[PDB]
Amino acid sequence: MSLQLLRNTRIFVSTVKTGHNKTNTQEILVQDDISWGQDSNSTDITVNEAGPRPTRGSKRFNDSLNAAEWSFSTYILPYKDKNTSKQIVPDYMLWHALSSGRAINLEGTTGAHNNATNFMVNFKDNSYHELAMLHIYILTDKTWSYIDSCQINQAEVNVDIEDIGRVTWSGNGNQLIPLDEQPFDPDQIGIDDETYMTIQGSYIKNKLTILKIKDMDTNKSYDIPITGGTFTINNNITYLTPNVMSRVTIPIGSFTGAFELTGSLTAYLNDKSLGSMELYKDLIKTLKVVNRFEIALVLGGEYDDERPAA
Amino acid sequence: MSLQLLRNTRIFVSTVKTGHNKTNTQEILVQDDISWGQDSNSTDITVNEAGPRPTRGSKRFNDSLNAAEWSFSTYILPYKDKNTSKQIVPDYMLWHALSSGRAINLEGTTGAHNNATNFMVNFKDNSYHELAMLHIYILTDKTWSYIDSCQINQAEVNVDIEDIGRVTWSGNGNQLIPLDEQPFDPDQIGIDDETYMTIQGSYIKNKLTILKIKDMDTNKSYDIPITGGTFTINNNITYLTPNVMSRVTIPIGSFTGAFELTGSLTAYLNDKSLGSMELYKDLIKTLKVVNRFEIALVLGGEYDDERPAAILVAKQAHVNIPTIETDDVLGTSVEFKAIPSDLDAGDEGYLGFSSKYTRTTINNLIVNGDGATDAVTAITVKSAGNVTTLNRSATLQMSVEVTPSSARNKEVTWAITAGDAATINATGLLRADASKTGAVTVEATAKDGSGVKGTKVITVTAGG
Amino acid sequence: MDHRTSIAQAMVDRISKQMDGSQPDEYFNNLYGNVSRQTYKFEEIREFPYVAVHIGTETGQYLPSGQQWMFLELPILVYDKEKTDIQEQLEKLVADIKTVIDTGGNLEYTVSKPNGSTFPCEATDMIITSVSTDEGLLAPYGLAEINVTVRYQPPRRSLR
Amino acid sequence: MDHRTSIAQAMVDRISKQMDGSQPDEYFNNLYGNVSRQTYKFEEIREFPYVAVHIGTETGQYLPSGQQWMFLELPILVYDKEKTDIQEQLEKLVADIKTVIDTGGNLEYTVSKPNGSTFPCEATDMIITSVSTDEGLLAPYGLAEINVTVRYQPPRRSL
Amino acid sequence: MDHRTSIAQAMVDRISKQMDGSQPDEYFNNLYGNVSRQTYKFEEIREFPYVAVHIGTETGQYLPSGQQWMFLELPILVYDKEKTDIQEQLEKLVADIKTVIDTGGNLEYTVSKPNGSTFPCEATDMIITSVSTDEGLLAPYGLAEINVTVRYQPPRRSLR
């Protein structure tokens, strides 16, 4: 007899269900905002006839099961890997799944492919009816539970919060299957002490978040100090499920929606030329149907000295 | 000149409007969550024309009047009444109104019928287009206001709140009519001091709220300590109203909706067998269309000593799929809805209240629906002549003895489960035949559904 | 309609009646009736282990129907001479008192009415807030502050 | 059914068993069993380093099914003499204390019953909310206090 | 696992090596290595200007994945003898310390492991809360209290 404490939950992400290894599976550090579950639909049938002494009653039927949901926040932690001497991030399968649908290939030129200088994810080659499938293995205390097939639906990055920059993932899953026996040795698979040692010296502070923005049509660069901002990558994943009435069913497939790299900014008014006031004036006066602005958000700032940044 | 303070409001309930007496009228102690009123509909007609210098203006017409609303919370307070020496609760008129539509009859066997052992409300005999009609008389300070004809619509029971268990009533009324003169002497009608003294020593604590839950499909009993929960009884009452335009009207009639003994539960994750983990795993893995769970939520817990408790019984209660909850400590919430054996049967569930609820009493109530009537606890099988063996082509009309001796259903069923060496009938006449070289066992199942088992292995062989 | 001293007397007599050796398998110690509603001074006391029931403030609430919720605070003090070790003995005693205060029924106090007649009465519930130990005191003489807020409802009045 | 002093003994023997010469690569200091929940006068200590445990206040919240949430508080104090440097050895001591608090299984505190029915039980939580040390005292002497809010659910079902 | 004094030593040595005259165009003064992690007494000090790095409490937070946030308070005191005027000198010195604390990388402290091996480590960020001046002190002796809360994360542990 024991109670499961949220402080004792570790999240793993594997591209397959068997033959787990350090390459095809890994643990991703999760912040206190962790949530998962799987709600269900329900139809209740009742009757209405005008006869005296009516039939007051109803019966409930379980029809289907909504695709599981989930969301957790992980800090962005670039670092060099001794094995490959190339920059990587801990949760790189997550980025790969959010990007492409082809098998992960770090050395490639699209999607979650790293480089000696830096690890960069390229959203080209994301045309796929189903992005790369991930199964989220959730360990808490000692119980074992995993989600069959997950596809990341949203990655929200918020900078206004003064704390270190974080990313809020979110997706969906077919069915939350609890597990009775361990799938793999956690200590071997999970990130070892040395990797944590190396990583902790790579956090990125939003205290230094410079932004670059230039109006391509006018070729003018605006000097803007942000006060807050966000940007999210949304796939608008829709989960398709059958509609059998007699037997309870499960969402079998998924269709990727429309890519949306939506984002937002905010700043104070600054009369100095090429400031916020200048941009506001230009945008309001010009009043064009469409615009072409090259926006760059530089979390953690840049400097002559070598330092982390996303 | 004076002001009216909510602290000086007394809520009465009467089944009639005249000849008020202690039987046809009663006072119910309420809580600070008391609210009532009667809002009105309104239509505004305006015009839109293209002429220069338009006609900017409008006029408002009072069309109808929505049925009144109201809601108060009263503590569940079982106690014995010296006049009748039977368990009752102060707001028994309210329970009767929520239950049935026939005239209140405490001695009966349906609806708000009390018993010497305990006071029970039975939801059978609630098939009525209009439940029992009450007229709430509200006394505040000195002004009088009453609601013509109201029918209870919801009764919410929340246990998570640490305070003593409370019930939130709610309903609707035709027309909140103010009253210019007192209807009856309040002091005589209202609960006297002695009854209050008797009541206060019978409050119910949610600090002790044990729950029993068993999957009647698998006959497995789970051991679940709750952290919060609730159950609401809803009648989905709707109020018909005329639609005359020239004059303002009032809702005249009512149509009871669909019964719904909906409720919910929540608990921490416990790895011990037959705990919340086990229920989670069963319900998620099995994934059945329908479920048949016998849910018993026992406010005030049970004890060998006599102590108060309020009891909810929902036989064959449908259960939804549990949803894990994430916080400082993990927890899972289970939502359930009590479904009947048949749509018109009306056996969704029943309740029990009493100050003297004992573990034996509570179990017999659960398995019979009444405290007074007992139930079988332990069963053993006694063979005719106390024989532990039998030869082929011989009959053994083995008998049985139940416990306690006061069980109402002394009759039990007969079954041969393990082995094929003898045949028994309803009478209990166990019979063997030739070519029976294996030992057999005889099983019994109580007719009352208590869940008692009696085993005996008889070595029936080729004989001498 | 106050019963403060009555509530304290009920608690003290419960302690006394439910501390004898009649339940050795349920309780640890046996105060032998060394329980009182008041103490003159820690120094004044002579016999140990000794438990003191104090009287505190009495907050109140008012409810619409003329009811009256009133919460009474009942700090309880215990003492013991170090026969073997203060900590373990005080733990034993405090666990025993917690068992006395959480098990059983309700606080039965007798209210003496102005007419001169005494009626049995019962509190609603008894919840302990916190148990604190005043460490650093004289080594042979220990102390454990156990605070309780007895919730009791008086005879109905204040109709007008 | 508090088991407060049972928890204190759990702490004292936990520290004693751990932080021994068996595992020096993991923890810095060795105490040779020099740890006790009994507080003494500071001048009275015999040898250093020495660690003492205080039993603080114990708040409680009830739950519907009899479950109780007791947040017992155990201040931890350490004393040492400036043999090489107060700050460094005190740091090593506090780091070892934190490691033993976090690493390993939960508390295993013995529950003693009136009828000698002793069986084991365990807490659920162990968080070192705040660590602080005293400064300006006799330079040879040092003091660091650890605030551990051991949160434990008593085996109420026994009653 | 703690590195409190290790953090203080890292900050003090950073002050030392980033205050020489190697950056006259960025920093004002030159402490000439007159920086220490502990002071016996304000009166005990002899050479000015002198900056003292103190050790405060350390609040703790626990995150689900076994991570561990530790917030360490690092009050820093400075002193200066009134060569021209206390106010301006303390302003110059506090500006120097703010530059030292807001420019450059992260707090590089060395964590000595029990096995006997020391590994380089880096704090996450170093945010100051407020700067305070204890005016009214002896005129030739000034004081400026600059408060910092270094946010550092220890080696991963507490898995179970």
Residue numbers in the entry:
A (entry chain I): 1 to 310
B (entry chain H): 1 to 464
C (entry chain C), E (entry chain E): 1 to 160
D (entry chain D): 1 to 159
Question: Can you list sentences taken from the study reporting this PDB entry?
Answer:
Using electron cryo-microscopy (cryo-EM) and single particle analysis, we determined the organization of the tail proximal extremity of siphophage T5 that possesses a long flexible tail and solved the structure of its tail terminator protein p142 (TrP142). In siphophages, functional tails are produced after capping of the tail tube by the tail terminator proteins (TrP), of which siphophage λ gpU is the prototype. TrPp142 is a 161-residues protein, mainly formed by a four-strand antiparallel β-sheet that lines the lumen of the tube, flanked by two α-helices, and a short loop between β-strands 1 and 2.
We also imaged T5 tails after interaction with E. coli receptor FhuA reconstituted into nanodiscs (Tail-FhuA) with cryo-EM. At the resolution of our maps, no conformational change was observed in TrPp142 monomers or hexamer (rmsd 0.43 Å over 156 residues between Tail and Tail-FhuA individual monomers), and neither in TTPpb6. For the latter, it was already shown that the T5 tail tube, formed of a stack of TTPpb6 trimeric rings, does not undergo any conformational changes upon interaction with FhuA and that the signal of the infection is not transmitted from the receptor to the capsid through the tube itself. Because TMPpb2 is expelled during the infection process, the lumen of the tube is empty in Tail-FhuA, which constitutes the only difference between the two EM maps of the tail proximal extremity. By also determining the structure of the T5 tail proximal extremity after interaction with T5 bacterial receptor FhuA, we showed that no conformational changes occur in TrPp142 and confirmed that the infection signal transduction is not carried by the tube itself. TrPs homologous proteins from myophages or tail-like machines also show no conformational change upon infection.
